[PDB]
């Protein structure tokens, strides 16, 4: 039985995803989330398919950029594991809760 050591596959995953450009969140589920949230703000709304895709491209770029900053915060504290507090520090410096 062969087994890669913890962290080896994760690194392989980082190289793989940093090399690709496809959306990482499933499409239908993201669309339901957008419709649910929008519905709570206003009922009877419709959506062009590209409107939903625009939201997904932006949300994913936002999250990826947030994880990069979160990663620097974890590393700053001498860790390699990101934790809720790293995300909070990053959001606070960014002014999303400063």
């Amino acid at each position: 039985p062969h087994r890669y050591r913890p962290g080896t596959v994760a690194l392989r995953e980082i190289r793989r995803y940093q090399k690709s450009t496809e959306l990482l969140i499933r499409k239908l589920p993201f669309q339901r989330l957008v419709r649910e949230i929008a519905q709570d703000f206003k009922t009877d709304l419709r959506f062009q398919s590209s409107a939903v895709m625009a939201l997904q491209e932006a949300s994913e770029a936002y999250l990826v950029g947030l994880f990069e900053d979160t990663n620097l915060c974890a590393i700053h504290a001498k860790r390699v594991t990101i934790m809720p507090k790293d995300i909070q520090l990053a959001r606070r410096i960014r002014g999303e809760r400063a």
Partner: peptide
């Protein structure tokens, strides 16, 4: 700016390497 379907630059913090 955010470029749709653009992805990001390959970049792995040095401390993360084995």
């Amino acid at each position: 700016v955010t470029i749709a379907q653009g992805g990001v630059l390959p970049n792995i913090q040095a401390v993360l390497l084995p």
